């Protein structure tokens, strides 16, 4: 059976301003099958009560999901998204970079 590994972007809802409340998003897309595990990380530690969208799919049948939570960026605090999926041999971590 043909599997497809997820694309991953992690980014902010609004432009990042230190001290200003925002949302941290992790968008996972283009994957099959649908089972997937996603965590948001603050300094390497899982943020609790992260929300997500309901499973839907694109024209080519591949799935997408948005994970998100409120956060306040600062210059020191590090944020990231950890993704696991059957196509990955270990969880993939993508760091938040405010210029992307």
């Amino acid at each position: 059976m043909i599997q497809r590994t997820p694309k991953i972007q992690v980014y902010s809802r609004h432009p990042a301003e230190n001290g200003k409340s925002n949302f941290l998003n992790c968008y996972v897309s283009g994957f099959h099958p649908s089972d997937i595990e996603v965590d948001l990380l603050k300094n390497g530690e899982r943020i609790e009560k992260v929300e997500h969208s309901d499973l839907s799919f694109s024209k080519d049948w591949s799935f997408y999901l948005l994970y998100y939570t409120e956060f306040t960026p600062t210059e020191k605090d590090e944020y990231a998204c950890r993704v696991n999926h059957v196509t990955l041999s270990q969880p993939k971590i993508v760091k938040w970079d405010r210029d992307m």
Binding site: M1, F23, P33, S56, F57
Partner: protein, 276 residues
């Protein structure tokens, strides 16, 4: 001015772990408006946009009834698909269906859709004629024979030319504040040194609706679509979308490059440059 309505459905079997997970969502354009998830405690279809909330109790009962019956049909069909492909009962499999309609500016049907996939591949699709089928393999041809004997295509055609278009038109009117408003992208170019020899110019588009957009870099008027890194359009989480396009340029040559933005919320397409 042209619009769509789509219902998406996914059933995923999970042997040893109960009945298949069933999730379905409905969209008008790129706006989510309903959802059902079989794993909620007392599952009901729930509103997700303000303009559907005014539908009365009878609307929500009928939708929920449809959602529960679709789930049970999918459950049986998953068992059927194991027979058709001579598969074991041991693994998890996926059944997807999308259906819906497109309308033009004057509200007439432009196109109808009804299509299935098994395990991420095309299974059977209603053709654009709404009267004939494309089966992807000999398994789907068994479904096709059954559906031709029961005149399913004719039944789907009546739904798609009638209720689909009529209800899409109602939603567009009740939601005209949002559904009939395009938000243009907010745009700018940033500059990111790679080395003393070159730097990345990134052209940003933020806060736009709908999702459809074109972002391109040129260099002295010539498109750069082998050197452009273009990310997938992504949800901001507040109805809008984001996108960017990036090119690596030699130091000092930044003013040869222009970014070109097309989106339906803009009067004219934009032309942007790095402005130190």
């Amino acid at each position: 001015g042209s619009h769509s309505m789509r219902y998406f459905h996914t059933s995923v079997s999970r042997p040893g772990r109960g009945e298949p997970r069933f999730i379905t969502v409905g969209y008008v354009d790129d706006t989510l408006f309903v959802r059902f998830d079989s794993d909620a405690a007392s599952p009901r279809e729930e509103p997700r946009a303000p303009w559907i909330e005014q539908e009365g109790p009878e609307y929500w009962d009928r939708e929920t009834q449809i959602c529960k019956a679709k789930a049970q049909t999918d459950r049986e069909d998953l068992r059927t698909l194991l027979r058709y492909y001579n598969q074991s009962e041991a693994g998890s499999h996926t059944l997807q269906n999308m259906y819906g309609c497109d309308v033009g500016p004057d509200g007439r049907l432009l196109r109808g859709y009804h299509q299935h996939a098994y395990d991420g591949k095309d299974y059977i699709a209603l053709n654009e004629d709404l009267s004939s089928w494309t089966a992807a393999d000999t398994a789907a041809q068994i479904t096709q024979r059954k559906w031709e004997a029961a005149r399913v295509a004719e039944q789907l055609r009546a739904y798609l030319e009638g209720e689909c278009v009529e209800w899409l038109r109602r939603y567009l009117e009740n939601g005209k504040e949002t559904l009939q408003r395009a938000d243009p992208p907010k745009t700018h170019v940033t500059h990111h040194p790679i080395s003393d020899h070159e730097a990345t110019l990134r052209c940003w588009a933020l806060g736009f609706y709908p999702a459809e957009i074109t972002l391109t870099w040129q260099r002295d008027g010539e498109d750069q679509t082998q050197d452009t890194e273009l990310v997938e359009t992504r949800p901001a989480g507040d109805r809008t979308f984001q996108k960017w396009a990036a090119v690596v340029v030699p130091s000092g040559e930044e003013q040869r490059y222009t970014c070109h933005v097309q989106h339906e919320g803009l009067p004219k397409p934009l032309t942007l440059r790095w402005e130190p």
